[PDB]
Ligand binder design. Structure first.
Ligand SMILES: CC(=O)N[C@H]1[C@H]([C@H](O)[C@H](O)CO)O[C@@](O)(C(=O)O)C[C@@H]1O
Ligand SMILES: CC(=O)N[C@H]1[C@H]([C@H](O)[C@H](O)CO)O[C@@](O)(C(=O)O)C[C@@H]1O
Ligand SMILES: CC(=O)N[C@H]1[C@H]([C@H](O)[C@H](O)CO)O[C@@](O)(C(=O)O)C[C@@H]1O
Ligand SMILES: *[C@@H]1O[C@H](CO)[C@@H](O)[C@H](O)[C@H]1NC(C)=O
Ligand SMILES: *[C@@H]1O[C@H](CO)[C@@H](O)[C@H](O)[C@H]1NC(C)=O
Ligand SMILES: *[C@@H]1O[C@H](CO)[C@@H](O)[C@H](O)[C@H]1NC(C)=O
Ligand SMILES: *[C@@H]1O[C@H](CO)[C@@H](O)[C@H](O)[C@H]1NC(C)=O
Ligand SMILES: *[C@@H]1O[C@H](CO)[C@@H](O)[C@H](O)[C@H]1NC(C)=O
Ligand SMILES: *[C@@H]1O[C@H](CO)[C@@H](O)[C@H](O)[C@H]1NC(C)=O
Ligand SMILES: *[C@@H]1O[C@H](CO)[C@@H](O)[C@H](O)[C@H]1NC(C)=O
Ligand SMILES: *[C@@H]1O[C@H](CO)[C@@H](O)[C@H](O)[C@H]1NC(C)=O
Ligand SMILES: *[C@@H]1O[C@H](CO)[C@@H](O)[C@H](O)[C@H]1NC(C)=O
Lengths: 316, 170, 170, 316, 170, 316
């Protein structure tokens, strides 16, 4: 007698939100915000370098923990909390800027700068940088006077970047636990270090005095750095309290740097990383870590945003 | 809905219809029937599919660190960074909320439309041999067996053949 | 509008209708009448209400200072801050402009649709006892007193009762 | 004979804008951009601290104006234009960073560091920091030599944060209007201040010389600060030109800082503040001040954006 | 489309129609005709025009440098700047993609609607003197010469004049 | 017998994208992302200043190349790659901040500060800043001792901004290629420069030593700068290694600064500039240079985004 027509439905459909209504039940919906996580660093197919107890900046100066990282090469660079940039207590001026440089460097290639010395000491060491007992930073030279209190002869050294790429140059400045031990190394009187180039132009002076016994020392080393252009030339005018750069550093290519405390996994592939692991998703958004790096979904505040993929659900 | 069909005069949908999205349910001489319309169903499905693929999206844009979780950067620069990040979080949280709400509204109104497209098309086939009940059914004013029903479903039904008989039932 | 009703064939609206949004105005034996349709009116209203609540919005996201109005920060950092802020102002000024324009378009097309939903529904009740004038009126081909009009308004009107009489007026 | 149907209208409806048209008149619309203002700081229900003539940084060092604020506690902190961080002329290194810290500190709790001194002067004062005549910063010690030109014996003091939270440490450096008056206090010869810890590592040297007579003085005091971790230890190696920290500062909890020149009001409640008062609104946007802080509507360029809440208006 | 007209029952459009957007093509006594409907065409055009003007947009917001192409700024500040800029690029690349996709969907569904508005309006003129073929044509059940066709095109056609004759052809 | 109705179409329509589909062909579409370029600096109707071989910062100090720019006035300021801020080798502390100031300054007006000197030398020159042979920075004074090794008498000079607007003040510090040539000018012994005001408070010390021979010199000049408020006062306490400011600088009004290597053109008008020319467009977006300045379309990643302006295209 008649013919009827209609649509499908379900006893239990999912609630979504529209421009005009909240909690409208539809047939089939889907999640749009990623919350699922992988508690590992998915590094399948990538040249990875887990620094462990080596600090990123340490790969340039060369404390004991970084001896296996002095010329590393990577697509992915992982920093660990236990990593240390230093053996003898000290810091990097503009450390974060330098860290950010090294994270996308793709690794580093070292090259000797070629500095020879006329009548001073070089093999300066300490019980902090220990290998076979007292030693020093692998890439650095502890410049001293021949023996206690001897004069430090105002020297002048120089390096020229003979390569197509800019060179990372790093020197140090010694700050002694007292003006007493300062003289024991370089003698008394004002000591001055000046560094210049095309780009760069600045200078440095030591500041002896008693600091807390960190790592078994009251003294500190101030590491500094500049970015030397091709053909340009570095000049170190100094007379003590100076830590000489043996080798200059050159960037390899491209990479990414992350920070994490989870184990590395070469089984899974990922592009979006954060400190608690890897976010693998096709979803456009994520509610996990706002500081995630790499190729990531957009971080959003909402834990969930459901996208309707079915029609309106009118039940029986 | 905008098209007045789904949750409109069609008071509800058929949970028995596990066959497809839309379909015909008839009652005639032989009894009752219920089969799904692949054609209109696939159109809706192909459209919802289109949204999913265009939304599931990879930005080949790589972002690296500017913060530091192990060694906090200077407070001033640390605050500008946090300030910026939060501001952008606000934007994307907003965009995401709207985007989904906007799409969902459209998804619904699209399905409602696809139904109305089918109804208004059958009515065009029958022309004069039937009349609208109101709640989405065509009362046939002529005898229509099961093979007569199938003539409509595969879009072949001829109104001329049963024109005189059905018009007579005024 | 998209649905062709409001500012379409219904050449204009009734300023006399202070009763509701939509309504019926008839002319029969007893004279003329004009009452509002609560049902369809509330649907539109509930929908516009839905927009208002979802748009009137509090972000529990607290933002603090990074600038200083009493003691200007360093020029370089002061410029990056201003640069960032302006950029975000551009985004929100854009979003706001679009959002409102987008919603307004939808608000209008939603109301236009709600009218068309009512019209096409009455036409389904009357089936054969009336014909469309064009500008949104149903010319009745049978006698319909005031209580006959009220039978339609509360959705109870029976077409069978006056079928033979009205069909006769071909 | 017939039945007609239609919609409502009005002789005067409001113009809105759509995706496709400008100035389309509708039935009923509403404002979306807040412009209305409250010329007061709506602080109903909040622990408020109006600093007035006290500078925010002043609550740490303790000039006279900040004597009633040395241990404040707040949910809302208001800075005033007339507020001053200083009595004896001087500045804060990294002042804004510190201001931003204090604004969300929720107030401060002070604690003595416990420094005793062997044969020097302490009660150093000035006619600038006046209470009963010449006095000094409440939380600071003006370290001198016993009397004019006397030697300043190279001392060493130390403090350990024995609490679960980081401690705000602040010392000063005196810069004298001449090398003459410098010696009158600490004697001649180079004077040096070094400060270190786990995190921190740096040092300071005075710089005497004639400056403009600000506040009735040609000399300046350089206040510095660091953030000492739990269990960590501060060490001050010095020999003059030094302003000793009596008490260390500890953050209370959470708060918000604003800057304004309008009167406080505990009648009204607000979450969005700016210098000319409070923005109370449910509207998603606002065109009042782009630098508003708190829980605010989004600032936009437009003075107005009307949202249609009625249908298309077709008149008679 | 949403309205079921364009790429719906009207199986395709007329490449011969260089006259306008929409139009009537008839076949009667005198032969065949084909002319465009200015009225409905202009409505669609005025609407698409409206989009273009509102989208072609000048922001009187001036942005200046914070970078330096000749002498690179400090690496840290240089990275925050780049980081911010990229983030905003992401937002605008997103907004632009969506905006265009959103508008295009609406542009299409607007045109589809404008057709359906015309069809459903002609059907209202003819009332009883014709019936729907299905694929967007009105089979006239009464003789209609060229001047009878033109009576519809300029919206003047009277159904009463040919009512009795056409109804007779049941 | 019947009347049919439909829509238009074309044998070749354009593909666009919708919310639900990619590559849907429509009747007529249009481009939304600008890619077209003008390889010139469209400066029609604007007071333009092409600096050429003059560095922007150079217009303040006055090396030879900037002699024609010491008091410029502009709506549009163009920097060139070949431009140099310096004749005698040296740098600006906070150079970019200062560059950004000058770019929107609308030009500069100079004014003498009025410094007279009691028994020293002034006409200090060099073979670098050459005009008629050795000369110096036009706006600066090279302060010396009367002749070799003579004492540098601790002087004190001062300037007061007597104008409604803040004044740009610039002094220099000489860093000699050795402590030897340093004494040849100012004599031996520590030399100190201190500068203060309301806002400002700081000081400077020279740092002699051998640097690379840039421009034919091993010495460097450190230019510094501050922003002096109305009625406020600058004080220069010094005793050598000092480069005195002859004239103070005042900002004219408003302008825009750009950097480019394309030729200037007064035929075309533009508001959106970048280093390769001018972007003229009404289009809301652009895929040309992300660092474009002025009144620009929004930069986007996509090379193209087509906007449908016609209906769906269903062909025959
Ligand atoms: C090159 C040299 O002198 N090394 C010695 C140092 C330094 O003299 C001071 O540590 C400097 O601060 O002191 C030691 O106690 C140490 O740290 O192990 C012994 C070590 O042989
Ligand atoms: C501790 C001390 O010496 N206080 C004296 C100071 C300082 O010596 C110089 O001001 C330092 O610059 O000078 C005064 O004129 C002052 O400012 O009131 C007197 C005051 O008694
Ligand atoms: C005022 C003065 O002394 N000018 C002389 C300088 C400086 O003494 C040193 O260059 C300083 O570093 O040296 C010159 O060789 C030079 O640069 O042309 C000659 C010049 O007459
Ligand atoms: C619902 O939709 C998703 C994708 O949106 C689809 O993959 C899935 O088959 C559906 N889920 C269910 C339980 O039917
Ligand atoms: C830089 O180095 C290249 C070799 O790579 C050399 O040929 C060239 O002369 C140098 N250029 C300059 C400007 O010194
Ligand atoms: C910035 O935000 C993080 C959380 O994302 C917070 O832990 C940190 O303290 C903030 N950094 C600074 C410098 O305040
Ligand atoms: C930043 O913008 C404000 C206005 O919001 C302006 O008054 C101020 O001068 C700008 N700050 C800097 C550092 O230029
Ligand atoms: C119009 O709409 C607002 C909310 O959108 C409503 O509160 C109000 O009643 C209406 N205004 C008028 C004057 O009718
Ligand atoms: C830090 O302080 C706690 C007491 O709060 C103490 O028990 C603990 O030993 C200290 N930790 C370190 C690493 O010094
Ligand atoms: C920032 O991005 C530009 C390209 O826009 C790049 O060339 C430059 O190296 C980056 N700057 C820094 C400081 O890394
Ligand atoms: C298509 O549209 C543009 C504007 O959108 C219009 O100016 C032009 O006339 C049309 N182009 C063609 C080739 O018809
Ligand atoms: C500042 O300068 C004006 C002249 O422009 C002078 O009248 C006024 O006294 C000065 N104000 C102060 C606070 O020194």
């Amino acid at each position: 007698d008649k013919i009827c027509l209609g649509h499908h439905a379900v006893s239990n459909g999912t609630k979504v939100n529209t421009l005009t209504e909240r909690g409208v039940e539809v047939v089939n919906a889907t999640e749009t915000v990623e919350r699922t996580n992988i508690p590992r660093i998915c590094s399948k197919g990538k040249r990875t370098v887990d620094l462990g107890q080596c600090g990123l900046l340490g790969t340039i100066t060369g404390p004991p923990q970084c001896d296996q990282f002095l010329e590393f090469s990577a697509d992915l660079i992982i920093e660990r909390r236990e990593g240390s940039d230093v053996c003898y207590p000290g810091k990097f001026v503009n450390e974060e800027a330098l860290r950010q440089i090294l994270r996308e460097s793709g690794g580093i290639d070292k090259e000797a700068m070629g500095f020879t010395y006329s009548g001073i000491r070089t093999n300066g060491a300490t019980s902090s940088c220990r290998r076979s007992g007292s030693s020093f930073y692998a890439e650095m030279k502890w410049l001293l006077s021949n023996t206690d209190n001897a004069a430090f002869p105002q020297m002048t050294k120089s390096y020229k970047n003979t390569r197509k790429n800019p060179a990372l140059i790093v020197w140090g400045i010694h700050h002694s636990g007292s003006t007493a031990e300062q003289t024991k190394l370089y003698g008394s009187g004002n000591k001055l270090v000046t560094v210049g180039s095309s780009n760069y132009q600045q200078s440095f002076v030591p500041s002896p005095g008693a600091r807390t016994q960190v790592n078994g020392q009251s003294g500190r080393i101030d590491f500094h750095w500049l970015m030397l252009n091709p053909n340009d030339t570095v000049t170190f005018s100094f007379n003590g309290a100076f830590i000489a750069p043996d080798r200059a550093s050159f960037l390899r290519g491209k990479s990414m740097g992350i920070q994490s405390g989870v184990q590395v996994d070469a089984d899974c592939e990922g592009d979006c990383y954060y400190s608690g692991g890897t976010i693998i998703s096709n979803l456009p958004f994520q509610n996990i870590d706002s500081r995630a790096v790499g190729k990531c979904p957009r971080y959003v505040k909402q834990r969930s945003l459901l996208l309707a993929t079915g029609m309106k659900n009118v039940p029986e | 809905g905008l098209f007045g069909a789904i949750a409109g005069f069609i008071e509800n949908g058929w949970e028995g219809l596990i066959d497809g999205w839309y379909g015909f349910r008839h009652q005639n001489a032989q009894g009752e029937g219920t089969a799904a319309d692949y054609k209109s169903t696939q159109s809706a499905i192909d459209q919802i599919t289109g949204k999913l693929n265009r939304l599931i999206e990879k930005t080949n844009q790589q972002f690296e660190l500017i913060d530091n979780e192990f060694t906090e950067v200077e407070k001033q620069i640390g605050n500008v960074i946090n300030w910026t990040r939060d501001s952008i979080t606000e934007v994307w949280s907003y965009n995401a909320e709207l985007l989904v709400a906007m799409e969902n509204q459209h998804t619904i109104d699209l399905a409602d439309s696809e139904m109305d497209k089918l109804y208004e098309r059958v009515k065009r086939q029958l022309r004069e041999n039937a009349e609208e009940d109101g709640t989405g059914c065509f009362e046939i004013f002529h005898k229509c067996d099961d093979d007569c029903m199938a003539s409509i479903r595969n879009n072949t039904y001829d109104h001329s053949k049963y024109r005189e008989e059905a018009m007579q039932n005024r």
